UniProtKB/Swiss-Prot annotation, chain B:
Protein family membership: Belongs to the SNF2/RAD54 helicase family. SWR1 subfamily.
Source taxon at top rank: Eukaryota
Gene field: EP400
Protein name: E1A-binding protein p400
Subunit structure: Component of the NuA4 histone acetyltransferase complex which contains the catalytic subunit KAT5/TIP60 and the subunits EP400, TRRAP/PAF400, BRD8/SMAP, EPC1, DMAP1/DNMAP1, RUVBL1/TIP49, RUVBL2, ING3, actin, ACTL6A/BAF53A, MORF4L1/MRG15, MORF4L2/MRGX, MRGBP, YEATS4/GAS41, VPS72/YL1 and MEAF6. May also participate in the formation of NuA4 related complexes which lack the KAT5/TIP60 catalytic subunit, but which include the SWI/SNF related protein SRCAP. The NuA4 complex interacts with MYC and the adenovirus E1A protein. EP400 interacts with TRRAP, RUVBL1 and RUVBL2.
Annotated organism of origin: Homo sapiens (Human)
Curated annotation (Swiss-Prot), chain C:
Gene name per UniProt: VPS72
Organism: Homo sapiens (Human)
Primary role: Deposition-and-exchange histone chaperone specific for H2AZ1, specifically chaperones H2AZ1 and deposits it into nucleosomes. As component of the SRCAP complex, mediates the ATP-dependent exchange of histone H2AZ1/H2B dimers for nucleosomal H2A/H2B, leading to transcriptional regulation of selected genes by chromatin remodeling.
Lineage per the UniProt record: Eukaryota, Metazoa, Chordata, Craniata, Vertebrata
Name under which the protein is recorded: Vacuolar protein sorting-associated protein 72 homolog
Superkingdom: Eukaryota
Family membership: Belongs to the VPS72/YL1 family.
Length: 112, 97, 75
């Protein structure tokens, strides 16, 4: 039943008024070039937990919070910690394709 | 969010809400929102402001020069400007501005 | 069928390749510095007057010394 999946998703939701006080000492993946902000690490951990539970999610962070960087970090985590080097598909606006490519090369140049 | 739902995507269970079905429609919408909310992670710039880059806006008050003052007063005191301001015609006011 | 070490080596190679590719946009610094701050000039005879601070021998004690350099033996 959908209620069970919703309960699991609610159990995966980061706790806290701002969802920024997470005890999970999530270390940035070694393949990611650069330093992630604390909220970006929290988003990355949430994405990793969603992947481990085979669940989907919606990232509704306000514009400019680095959602693309969060996705790049998620790919780096999948490659380093989950062994998921497989073909990933990203669908973006044509005006953002070059931006996404440049961000991927800047943050994780090791990915084809 | 949930691939493989027992109910097909194109077979919408709720048609246009009739007066008698508006309550049922509203309750189903509320329950659907509650079901979808745990899959949505939303954070605002205010919550992370303590970690955001800091934008500083500064207003610098500049004195009107003597030549600027003279021209400003001449334009304000021109009879045509007074007539345009008394008439209140929008385009004339915007031209003066 | 590949292992993690092979994937990491391929990732390093592709990282270098992407960095060179990315440098098509990001190599704003090195190329401009080497193109502007050239250490040579157009061909032909040149006479270089040069004067540098040199330390005195038996801030520190210093003196000024002049060198004159000629491009070719003919001049």
């Amino acid at each position: 039943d959908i209620a069970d999946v919703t309960a699991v998703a609610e159990a995966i939701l980061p706790k806290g008024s701002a969802r920024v006080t997470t005890s999970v000492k999530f270390n940035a993946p070694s393949l990611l070039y650069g330093a992630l902000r604390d909220y970006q690490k929290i988003g990355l951990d949430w994405l990793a937990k969603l992947y481990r539970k085979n669940l989907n999610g919606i990232l509704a962070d306000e514009a400019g919070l680095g959602k693309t960087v969060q996705i790049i970090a998620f790919f780096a985590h999948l490659a380093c910690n989950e062994g998921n080097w497989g073909p990933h598909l990203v669908v973006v606006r044509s005006c953002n394709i070059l931006k996404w490519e440049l961000e991927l090369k800047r943050w994780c140049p090791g990915l084809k | 969010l949930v691939p493989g739902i027992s109910r097909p995507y194109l077979s919408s269970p709720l048609r246009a809400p009739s007066e008698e079905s508006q309550d049922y429609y509203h309750k189903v919408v509320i329950r659907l929102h509650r079901v979808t909310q745990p899959f949505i992670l939303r954070r605002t710039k205010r919550d992370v402001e303590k970690q955001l880059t800091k934008k500083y806006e500064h207003v610098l008050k500049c004195r009107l020069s003597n030549r600027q003052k003279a021209l400003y007063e001449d334009v304000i005191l021109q009879p045509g400007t007074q007539e345009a301001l008394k008439s209140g015609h929008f385009v004339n006011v915007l031209s003066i501005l | 069928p590949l292992t993690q070490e092979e994937l990491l080596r391929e990732a390093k190679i592709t990282e270098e390749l992407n960095l060179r590719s990315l440098e098509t946009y990001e190599r704003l610094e090195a190329d401009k510095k080497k193109q502007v701050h050239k250490k040579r000039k157009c061909p032909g005879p040149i006479i270089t007057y040069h004067s540098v601070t040199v330390p005195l021998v038996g801030p520190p004690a210093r003196c000024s010394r002049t060198f004159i350099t000629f491009s070719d033996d003919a001049t």
